[PDB]
KRR1 small subunit processome component (Saccharomyces cerevisiae), 226 residues
Amino acid sequence: VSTHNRDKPWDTDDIDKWKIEEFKEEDNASGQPFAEESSFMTLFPKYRESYLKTIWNDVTRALDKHNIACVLDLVEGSMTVKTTRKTYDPAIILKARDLIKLLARSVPFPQAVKILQDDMACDVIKIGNFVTNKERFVKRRQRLVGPNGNTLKALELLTKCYILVQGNTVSAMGPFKGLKEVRRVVEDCMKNIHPIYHIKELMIKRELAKRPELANEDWSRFLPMF
RNA sequence: CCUACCGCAGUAUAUUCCUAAACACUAUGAAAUGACCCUAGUUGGUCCAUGAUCAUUUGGGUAAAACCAUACUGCAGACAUCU
């Protein structure tokens, strides 16, 4: 019910709106760097520490590709990413903040480095606050993994996203629709709705998306209630 | 009578060619709207015809000296007259 909405004839259906253009150093017509240095700081758990000790230079090399300074201070236990004068991309500092958050949340660096690509996007879901009891929290966290990781793989097959369940956080790296789907699955799993309940619904949704006629109509009649 | 050690002065401590590297010079073309660096400036900093900063190869230069140890060579056995 989009009341009082004007028409948009300038929009073209042939143009791929989902397409993403690359960026270059000459892309900005200002010709000048950022006026103020912008930094993002995160903390990491102590058990990550030594692993970061062995990876950080490589991390710096990755940020050396994107002209972003980085620092890792063990005494505060913090990692900070800073924009530089040679930096020309305004969103790469946000992607570096996502990178250090993913590195703190136990995502390995060969997987975590791909967040610097424009296509990838990450979501960190906090699951410590849903239930207070320890045994129920452990059980519901094991529901996501299941036996031998299998349903977790199914969740990957549900979303085409890298999913890592560590401590109080679920880290998901992938497309935005898969991020929203795995957010739904993780929150409903922490609210004791079983993961297979959403896995079967996602499979039925994919089968309905296979048929364009079913995709035109509502899937709620065909799909079982949950 | 001789030999070795002892004293002092020397020589060698690998040699020749090619090549790699460092430092500096020299030859050629580029200079005052001169060149370089820094989240970078109401005049920032550094170098600069007393040669900066890039090239181009033009060719040659430097990498010692002293001492110890080892091996060899030579010089002398010296209390110093000299009026």
User: Anything to note?
Assistant: The first strand of chain A starts at residue 39 and ends at 43.
